[PDB]
Design a protein around this ligand. Structure first.
Ligand SMILES: C=C1/C(=C\C=C2/CCC[C@]3(C)[C@@H]([C@H](C)CCCC(C)(C)O)C[C@H](OC)[C@@H]23)C[C@@H](O)C[C@@H]1O
Length: 253
């Protein structure tokens, strides 16, 4: 029964463009990480101590700061994104920034030891570094289920960039104006994604895969709300702002 329309010229172009954008804004060598404030790991095998030292916060806050910059850059090259008013571009970036960081980071997440391996022991990031940045297990552990859940999809890079683009261009975000444009843009991306999956993804018995990807967008919303909860409390720490960046302040404040 399953019809399998071919990717259209436009759709193939969309994928090309998104692949090129990701390649321009996601360095797979991580050769910039050494420019961040150094990571510090001082023994904590304590919430009080966490908040007292915040040893990993300057380094991780720089990594998130750097990644938001990469994401803004990635957004600009999503076809259609420029046609939105800049006010709406900003709503979408601010609200998706942490979700996209969560998707993109999957390129460094390894199931070998359940860490984000960007090195080089110093830029290997584990659960325990996240807690050393002042967050708790209630965000960290689902973030790790999410990462694993996502590795096991074995996404083609075509789908991976399409999923970040769909994520960013979501019409149902607090404060959007032209929800209809965003939907129109998002729909251009989803249809491309649905078409690709049924042309280029084997077996296939997976009409399943699209649904699983859409569910990942939904897990992301929960994590986002929990990140935000925990950021709000993190910022109650005196002189915490110095350990952040102006951009992390604005995006999450
Ligand atoms: C960010 C990336 C990378 C790893 C991401 C990571 C690993 C370290 C902790 C992070 C950063 C979370 C914490 C909870 C964020 C804390 C932020 C703050 C202190 C402001 O509250 C968000 C996130 O999810 C994977 C985490 C490496 C590479 O794959 C590029 C990608 O761009």
């Amino acid at each position: 029964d399953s019809l399998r329309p071919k990717l259209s010229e436009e759709q193939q172009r969309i994928i090309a463009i998104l692949l090129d954008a990701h390649h321009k804004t996601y360095d797979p060598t991580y050769s910039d990480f050494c420019q961040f404030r150094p990571p510090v790991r001082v023994n904590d095998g304590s919430v009080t101590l966490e908040l007292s030292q915040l040893s990993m916060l300057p380094h991780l806050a720089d990594l998130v700061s750097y990644s938001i910059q990469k994401v803004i850059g990635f957004a600009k090259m999503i076809p259609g994104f420029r046609d939105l008013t800049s006010e709406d571009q900003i709503v979408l970036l601010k609200s998706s920034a942490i979700e996209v960081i969560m998707l993109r980071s999957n390129e460094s997440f390894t199931m070998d030891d359940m860490s984000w391996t960007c090195g080089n022991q110093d830029y290997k990031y584990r659960v325990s570094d996240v807690t050393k940045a002042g967050h708790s297990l209630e965000l960290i552990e689902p973030l790790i289920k999410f990462q694993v859940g996502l590795k096991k999809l074995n996404l083609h890079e075509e789908e991976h960039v399409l999923l970040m683009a769909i994520c960013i261009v979501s019409p149902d975000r607090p404060g959007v104006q032209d929800a209809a444009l965003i939907e129109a843009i998002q729909d251009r991306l989803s249809n491309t994604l649905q078409t690709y999956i049924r042309c280029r993804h084997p077996p296939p018995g997976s009409h399943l895969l699209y649904a699983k990807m859409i569910q990942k967008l939904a897990d992301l919303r929960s994590l986002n709300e929990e990140h935000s909860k925990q950021y709000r409390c993190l910022s109650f720490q005196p002189e915490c702002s110095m350990k952040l960046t102006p951009l992390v302040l604005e995006v999450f404040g």
